[PDB]
């Protein structure tokens, strides 16, 4: 499970578990843009079809 200090801080700062973010970088590294993508899909989610 690969992620730099800065990426780990961003995740922790926004209370994101690293296990629920799939990386897009080399060998599945988790990049800042992945934390940001997740944070953004997390807001759009409140408007997705469900029941």
């Amino acid at each position: 499970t690969l992620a730099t200090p800065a990426v780990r801080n961003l995740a922790m700062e926004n209370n994101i578990k690293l296990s629920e973010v799939v990386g897009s970088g080399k060998d599945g590294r988790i990049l800042k843009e992945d934390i940001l993508n997740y944070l953004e899909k997390q807001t759009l989610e409140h408007h997705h079809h469900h029941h």
């Binding site: 730099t4 200090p5 800065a6 990426v7 970088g25 080399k26 590294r29 990049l31 800042k32």
Partner: peptide
């Protein structure tokens, strides 16, 4: 670049 580094990464 190969690792998709961020500016902060290199700074640390």
């Amino acid at each position: 670049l190969e690792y998709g580094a961020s500016c902060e990464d290199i700074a640390r």
